[PDB]
Design a protein around this nucleic acid. Structure first.
Ligand SMILES: [Cl-]
Ligand SMILES: [Cl-]
Ligand SMILES: [Cl-]
Ligand SMILES: [Cl-]
Ligand SMILES: [Cl-]
Ligand SMILES: [K+]
Ligand SMILES: [K+]
Ligand SMILES: [K+]
Ligand SMILES: [K+]
Ligand SMILES: [Zn+2]
Ligand SMILES: [Zn+2]
Ligand SMILES: [Zn+2]
Ligand SMILES: [Zn+2]
Lengths: 75, 81
DNA sequence: TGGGGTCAGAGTTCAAT
DNA sequence: ATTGAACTCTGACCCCA
């Protein structure tokens, strides 16, 4: 699948268990690494609006099956 | 089979010896790559970074010194086919 | 075996915002 | 600080004698 399951943008392969784009991959990574927590509870997450709501973007990452445990230690 | 051994370097599972030492597939691949390209690394800390399964990639310098300390032989790495 | 190889999916960088 | 396009590294899983 070459469509990001989260935002619908063109996809880069599987990442953390989900067909996703580099943006959603990088966003999920940073969210898990820094243990970040956001505040919005169901905004639209597509390509153009993906950055508009960090809370909803991260919730959808999880809802599409992204695995926190797949984010490794910073090297 | 993997029942018999663990990696002398990081403690992950091992199916046997590589370059002279019971090691996992990761430390095997890591040691090979380091030698093949003659890579030099640097440690940001005190040259005693903990090397286990979770932390092994966090300092390549320390991972490499431990490969040597445990007995891995650079000369066992062959030329790239 | 214990040498070899591959490449998906982890990693990172850094210009642009 | 944050994003994401475009890179490098890793290691599970193969191939052989
Ligand atoms: Cl080194
Ligand atoms: Cl370091
Ligand atoms: Cl560990
Ligand atoms: Cl990173
Ligand atoms: Cl490297
Ligand atoms: K492969
Ligand atoms: K690749
Ligand atoms: K860059
Ligand atoms: K890997
Ligand atoms: Zn996406
Ligand atoms: Zn929202
Ligand atoms: Zn190891
Ligand atoms: Zn170190």
């Amino acid at each position: 699948k070459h469509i990001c399951a989260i935002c619908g943008d063109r996809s880069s392969g599987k990442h953390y268990g989900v067909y996703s784009c580099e943006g959603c991959k990088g966003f999920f990574k940073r969210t898990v690494r820094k243990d970040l927590t956001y505040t919005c509870k169901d905004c639209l997450i597509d390509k153009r609006q993906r950055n508009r709501c960090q809370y909803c973007r991260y919730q959808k990452c999880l809802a599409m099956g992204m695995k926190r445990e797949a984010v490794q230690e910073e090297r």
